[PDB]
Point group: D2
């Protein structure tokens, strides 16, 4: 039988976009195509507001937009736990929490874009022990992104190389590089972002005057 799997996506989702959502679908199909996995659930976990960030909309709104975006999904849900904590928590800790939650046990994997993988190389950004635990105890499902070479990042990292069987590279012959940064600026300029992010999310942004 196929190993059951839960995909966990950490990040800003400021706001959640069609590409963030597309990421989950590509990862699930890739894992199923291997013939040894069955993805049973996806989790969108918005980052805590304390994460010293450019400036994110309040997490209350980011969780809301994700919930609304996921209404038409029968397997992906938002989980506010991470954003409800008194403060920012390292990713490996969110994985531990959601793993405990799950506790015949499905494997919990971190779903991210290849760019995140490139950041593992940034000095002080990630603790080597976290990089190791993330790839060894949980797993990584990385979706391709233009300009990044996931296979090379893996080969050049002693830690990732050693646990590469637990890293799954997925990529669809599509080219969709819509950045939430662009989305925010377009919204701020009164321009349309329709068809770049869900209609339900555009409605919420309009109703609550976000990204002005």
């Amino acid at each position: 039988s196929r190993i059951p799997v839960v995909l966990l996506a950490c990040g800003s989702f400021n706001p959640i976009t069609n590409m963030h959502l597309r990421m989950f679908e590509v990862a699930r199909d890739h894992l199923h195509q291997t013939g040894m996995y069955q993805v049973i659930q996806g989790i969108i976990s918005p980052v805590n507001d304390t994460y010293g960030k450019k400036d994110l909309a309040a997490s209350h709104h980011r969780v809301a937009m994700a919930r609304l975006a996921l209404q038409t999904s029968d397997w992906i849900r938002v989980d506010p736990w991470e954003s409800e904590q008194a403060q920012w928590m390292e990713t490996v800790k969110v994985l531990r929490h959601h793993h405990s939650k799950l506790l015949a046990v499905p494997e919990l994997k971190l779903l991210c874009g290849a760019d995140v993988l490139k950041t593992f190389q940034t000095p002080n950004l990630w603790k080597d022990a976290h990089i190791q635990e993330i790839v060894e105890k949980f797993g990584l499902v990385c979706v391709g992104r233009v300009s990044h070479d996931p296979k090379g990042y893996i080969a050049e990292s002693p830690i990732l190389r050693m646990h590469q069987h637990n890293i799954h590279l997925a990529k669809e012959p599509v080219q969709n590089e819509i950045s939430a940064t662009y989305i925010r600026r377009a919204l701020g300029q009164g321009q349309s972002v329709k068809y770049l992010i869900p209609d339900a999310v555009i409605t919420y942004i309009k109703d609550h005057g976000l990204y002005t």
Copy 2:
């Protein structure tokens, strides 16, 4: 006052995708940013089935998918006229028809991707007299596409160069090259295309067993 404008998009829409729809939004914002136009409507006109094509799903289905995709749009509608004709009609004729329909009169412009513009250079593809009438009597709103240089196509074409004031180049700093061809193959392989095309279109394709 701003000149009123109707955007007409001709093509396969086999099936209509988020990018086809995105094209309309980018064009409208570009025309409004000029300060001299007010886009009052968009028309999606699926190509007749007789158009000797690879093989398109029946036009009945393509019109349906467009209608469903456009349910959440308050300014874009599908018009089956072109596909209901006994046979394929040159684009300039569809423009004339929709122009007559409109008949204090708004300008009707052909909305297309920069790749279509590149095809004007293909021998026998378009009649020079049609290329001229299309750009002179109606107008062109072209949305950028990776790999194409619209400005160069215009400069190297005596006809387009002469009527370049009637060609409007729009492009959003986004990279979305999802091809309907890829969509069809993904569907045929049982893979997800969710978030690449509208949920309402995926539902119809599933219910009617299309693209198998």
Copy 3:
């Protein structure tokens, strides 16, 4: 033993660029990795001047630039035959001519980008009989390009899908979308195109006042 292969690329090469050149290298590495072939030579064949077209520099200029571009190549060369003919010639006929030369035996395959492959669908652009001869008698090596889905073009063409064993899809993991149209416009504006096309081609362009 490996099947000896010769790759032929037809196109305007107006001017030849680094992507044109990259195409040969990618196609060769791909054929070699199959293990069934051994590419022994590449041939750049500039189209004839009568090819009812845009802003096409005189053929001898395009042959000379390709030649300068190829000086650092140990296996690729430009063959002026096609451009030196009196009139334009369908591509199958260029494939027959070079097939003849090969006999004063290596397999002669047509090398092109995915965009060319999509043109096989354009009404009346190619004779079905020619598309068949190309992939049945000779062979087709296609390099990926952004926005194109080669596998889908092949599956949807009743002619191509029957000859899949002779069609090789070479994947381009590097986003390298340089447009010659862009190259020409930039030059005409006095902007740099260095590192986009060969240094010697740039010098030649300048010395002969091309693309102004």
Copy 4:
């Protein structure tokens, strides 16, 4: 009269590629088109070997390749100072050193791709004081890259948006996303990278057995 400018690019240049080089040309053409400047020289400054990093070839090798790459450049040169220092140095400090050299006056601006600009947000990666000195004392010229929205990074950074007059966004109309990570992996697999990086750099790599 025009303000004399010197462009400084810091990075690993491991190895230097055609996109790295293209970056200088694009930035120069952009500064010149403003009319307020006249770029008099470009400087490639390879990072020091102690830069806690990946698979970094010895600095003298990276300086030599950059030098071979720059032989056909009449205005760009590599300066080994940074790599020849004893330890790694924050970029502002490299900007001060070269600012000093300039005085044995030209404006010294930091040249980088949009992706670098997005890293100014990464927690603790850059000192706010340094980001300020960079765009207040010196200046920043940024070349566009796929998936990045520079205008948005600038607007959302309270530091950057205050110094917009010293930040220049150079647009790259050519999709040229070459990854050095990819270059290295391809080489290690014995695949060609010709036309992606300079011929002489390839020769040097081979002669010194780099990236195997």
